[PDB]
Structure 1
Amino acid sequence: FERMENKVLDMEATSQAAGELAGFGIENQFAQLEASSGVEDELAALKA
């Protein structure tokens, strides 16, 4: 169980290393994706 717990702590350390690294433009791209989804809802309201 201690060997498995050391592998869990390696996945936690890997997740911490990804979390500090992964600051990206893609969050602003998701805001543009939500705006595009809002345009498809406005086209659905126009169709209705």
Structure 2
Amino acid sequence: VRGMNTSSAMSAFERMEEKVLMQESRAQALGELAGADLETQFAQLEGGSDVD
């Protein structure tokens, strides 16, 4: 309850959150870097021209 050194629930939460946060943030951040390209924003305008 007080959280001795290897209290299985608390220790597991720590180890999972290390993976969980790093992976998810990497994917969002690298996804925004891959999506940063100006020509891709031009592809949204192109999709507008194409549908019209």
Superposition TM-score, scaled by structure 2 size = 0.49
Tell me how large the CA RMSD over aligned residues is. 1.7
| Higher RCO (C-alpha under 8 Å, 6+ residues apart) | 2
Residue 24 of structure 2 corresponds to which residue in structure 1? Answer: 12
State the percentage of identical aligned residues. Answer: 31
Q: Which ranges of 4 or more aligned residues in structure 1 deviate by more than 6 Å?
A: none
> Max radius of gyration: which structure?
2
Which has the larger helix fraction? 1
Q: Which runs of 5+ in 1 are unaligned?
A: 39-48
Q: Which runs of 5+ in 2 are unaligned?
A: 1-12
Superposition TM-score, scaled by structure 1 size = 0.51
Across the two proteins, how many residue pairs are aligned to each other?
36
